[PDB]
Nucleic acid binder design. Sequence first.
RNA 1: ACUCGUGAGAGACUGCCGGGGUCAACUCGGAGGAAGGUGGGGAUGACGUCAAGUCAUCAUGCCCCUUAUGUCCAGGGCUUCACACAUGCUACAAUGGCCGGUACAAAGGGCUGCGAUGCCGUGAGGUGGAGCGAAUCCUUUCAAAGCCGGUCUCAGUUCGGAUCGGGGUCUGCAACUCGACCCCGUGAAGUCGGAGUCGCUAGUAAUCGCAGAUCAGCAACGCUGCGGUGAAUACGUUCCCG
Lengths: 208, 60, 99, 82, 116, 126, 155
Amino acid sequence: GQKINPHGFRLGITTEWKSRWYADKQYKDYVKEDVAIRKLLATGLERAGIADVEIERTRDRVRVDIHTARPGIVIGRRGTEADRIRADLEKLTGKQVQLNILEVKNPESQAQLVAQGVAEQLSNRVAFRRAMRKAIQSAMRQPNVKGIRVQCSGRLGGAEMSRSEFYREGRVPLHTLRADIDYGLYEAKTTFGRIGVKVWIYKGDIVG
Amino acid sequence: AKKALVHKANKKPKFAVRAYTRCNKCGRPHSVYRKFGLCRICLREMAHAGELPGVQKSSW
Amino acid sequence: GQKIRIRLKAYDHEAIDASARKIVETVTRTGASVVGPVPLPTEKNVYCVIRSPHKYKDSREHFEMRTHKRLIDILDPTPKTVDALMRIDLPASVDVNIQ
Amino acid sequence: PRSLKKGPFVDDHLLKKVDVQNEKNTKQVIKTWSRRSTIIPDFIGHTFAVHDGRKHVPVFVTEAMVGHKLGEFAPTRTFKGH
Amino acid sequence: ARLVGVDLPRDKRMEIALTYIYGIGRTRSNEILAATGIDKNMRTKDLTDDQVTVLRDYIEGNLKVEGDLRREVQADIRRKIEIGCYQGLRHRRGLPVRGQRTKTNARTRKGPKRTI
Amino acid sequence: PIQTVGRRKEAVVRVRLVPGTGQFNLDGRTLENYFPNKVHQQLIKAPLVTVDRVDQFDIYAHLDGGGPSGQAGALRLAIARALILVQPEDRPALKKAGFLTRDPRAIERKKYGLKKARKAPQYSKR
Amino acid sequence: PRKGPAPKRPLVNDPVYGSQLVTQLVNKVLLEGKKSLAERIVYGALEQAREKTGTDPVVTLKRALDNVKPALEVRSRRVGGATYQVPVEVRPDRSTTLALRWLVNFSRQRREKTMVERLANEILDASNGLGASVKRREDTHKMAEANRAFAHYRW
RNA sequence: ACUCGUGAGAGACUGCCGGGGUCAACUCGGAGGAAGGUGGGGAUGACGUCAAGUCAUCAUGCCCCUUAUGUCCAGGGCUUCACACAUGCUACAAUGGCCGGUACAAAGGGCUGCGAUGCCGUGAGGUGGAGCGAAUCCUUUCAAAGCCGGUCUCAGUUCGGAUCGGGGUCUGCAACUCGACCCCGUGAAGUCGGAGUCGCUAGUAAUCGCAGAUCAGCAACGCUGCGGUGAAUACGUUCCCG
Ligand SMILES: [Mg+2]
Ligand SMILES: [Mg+2]
Ligand SMILES: [Mg+2]
Ligand SMILES: [Mg+2]
Ligand SMILES: [Mg+2]
Ligand SMILES: [Mg+2]
Ligand SMILES: [Mg+2]
Ligand SMILES: [Mg+2]
Ligand SMILES: [Mg+2]
Ligand SMILES: [Mg+2]
Ligand SMILES: [Mg+2]
Ligand SMILES: [Mg+2]
Ligand SMILES: [Mg+2]
Ligand SMILES: [Mg+2]
Ligand SMILES: [Zn+2]
């Protein structure tokens, strides 16, 4: 357990909470609902490519912002998917929700989405070295990215002995608190088990 | 956390003292905090994700 | 005369100070007296958890929850000013209790 | 000990049975799972087969046993020695 | 002095001297001396036969001590053993009777370690 | 008025140096009631013995927090600062004797895995 | 102390007697941080000394110190598997440390009812050269002189 | 106006002065300053290692069960006891025990919760409920060690408080197995611990209380944290371990 989660390490300084509310008495109930919402969302738009979910609460208003690579599949042109999700949302939550389905500017700068892309290639029996190098090159071309690291571990290539390989390009200063490190993790599903993909994308320094 | 036990922990028991808390995310019986409704493992994970408002890593 | 106390609570101090400005400005624009944002002591809740899922009772991680507090006492509550305070739009990050 | 405000505790079912038997002047063997009920003086002549977790042990009540719990007379654990 | 069969210590304060009676501890001592009006700070040397008489009269009246008390204690243990209650079986075995640990400790009841 | 604050450990004292003959109103008490220990007395009045104005002042003090020895140390600091206000040219002597330093020594926090801040659990090889 | 000697903490001057020897003595009597108790133990013992000898207590304390301070000491060194007691000179500060430690430790082993009595009597005996602390000094020197041959190690 | 609370900011940089130095790094000392030389302490664990730990938080490949290896319930067990190891706590006392008086904290917790006054109980506690979602009220006006006084007088004791007898309180549907606490009685081993072995370099060790999480209640002497009182010693790198 050698590496502190990059997001949590910077949570007070360089990154921000993925949910905004205040409650004293309702805190436990709010968390329970959040758990339910995020499990309902993480297992719905899997092939849509979700990076972030932000949940805002106040009175009964439940604002859910879903960041996605392409919103096309997250909203049918008839609103079909928005209506289906809002239906299950309000049902579960008990109150009224406003899905603000957004979209990500630079998909290939987004560590969670880069992790999903590597994972899906491994799910489609792509040589893991290929997927690693592809993600590295795509990310480094984009203007903010000053460095990237990608790590895949598990039964790589279907072998019986676990391997943990990593490729790195540029700077990835994990120990620097002011360094803006974007972290993503995704679990690729394969005939021989699960292989974990971690991505660290350094995008520069924040002073506040 | 066998699903039967998770459901039975959500039912009203016939005696008030049979009620016990289980982690809302995974069902773990031990080390469930009252204010969060989560076990120590889920607490650590969610707090690192920033999914618990106001909860941050503590140093002093 | 009648007095209204606004207790403001938040987790981030930046959100709490920003929302103490918004209220003080609204009250000044409606001409009432505002005692101002008095800073109350922060509450600190501390949690200690075992890092590993099993058997490593000497590896721990401390977590913190700070709650910042600001008291705003508004004197001379003109009914227009009361209506304004009820119609201010404030972030969900900030809890406003009005008395 | 159970506080005197509440009096002695006896499982409602158990009570019912012993009452009936002593009301109809009869001393039958009463099958009981209730380890936790106190011996009331009403029990003095009755015989109880009380569960020890494995079987029912015959307990014959006596004057000197009143106010003890029924489970005190059916040992749970067996230890012959090492 | 001589009190209910017990020789009180040579020169001990009264509140301590009375605890040498098998039925009397420090609380009952202070009680008895308050009711009899004898100064608890007195030495046993200075105790007069008249005071000894008032002492014997009070504690033989209100209190059960010495043999009477020992017989009652033995009778209470014997009852438990006879009726076959759980505590009685524990007395037979020479093991803790108040649900204490036996895997370790329990030496006061078990005696010295007979290592195997 | 002359007012100054001295701090030591978790004790804050507020001294009011006024002209007098060597009297202390430590929360309403003299320097023998509040601080019976002779060592504490020698400590509180040490700055005055360096200036030589042991009987040239009265002191009024509010003592809060910490304990007897912390409050004694906070007092000595407060007084020494008050002397700097009364007569600035005493600063070379008072600081040379070290009375103007705020002693930063505070209780070290207890660390997890340990019994105290440094005391470790008993170790065994096997 | 692989990187060199560490600084010695300044000792204050006793308010009642004005010897730093006295406050050093209280820091040896000190148990469990109960300094006020150790303080009055030492003050009481010096008063018992003052009344029994008539003379100034700090002066007799210094005299008893000078009769129990070791000048020469033995340090053990393994050399060729054989273990040799090596005579080494005692630096002045260590001499007084040793003397005071010996005085207090034998006072704790004395027979009188209270520590004030035991400490005062040990101080008085050591002023005359009679006490157990004096015998310890003499035994320390006896072992040094018996090992004079092993001084050539000079470690 | 002093504290204090919490916001913004200043401050430590080998920056300045003297001597060492490759006019080098860096070093020894001095001034100024609250602080001096990464000021003290957290958070932070590189590439790897041990086929270390965890399929019992969770997830998951493959195998197995599906009238059971699923699932509901009552009772019992996880609390056994001739022993052994390990981590602690309380002691063996007078630098103490007991009684009386009296002083000085920090941090934290509280809603079918924390609960003040008064009254009733020797006491645990009862009764009743003021006031507080709390810098407000409750957790006494919040401690103990400490300081003053008296008493015990080196005794297995006025040390010790195990065990066991009797009588109670509270929580809970229910304290037999198997709860904590209180009162009366009882009064064990224990006289500073063999070979050996552990922690600690200053607000440290030692010692003293306080709070919190879990939690109806608690096996809490545990754990996480908070303040009070406060030492000794470090010549040195021959020797042991890494
Ligand atoms: Mg429970
Ligand atoms: Mg007796
Ligand atoms: Mg061993
Ligand atoms: Mg670092
Ligand atoms: Mg293995
Ligand atoms: Mg399985
Ligand atoms: Mg069951
Ligand atoms: Mg167990
Ligand atoms: Mg005692
Ligand atoms: Mg013995
Ligand atoms: Mg003895
Ligand atoms: Mg060190
Ligand atoms: Mg509890
Ligand atoms: Mg401490
Ligand atoms: Zn969980």
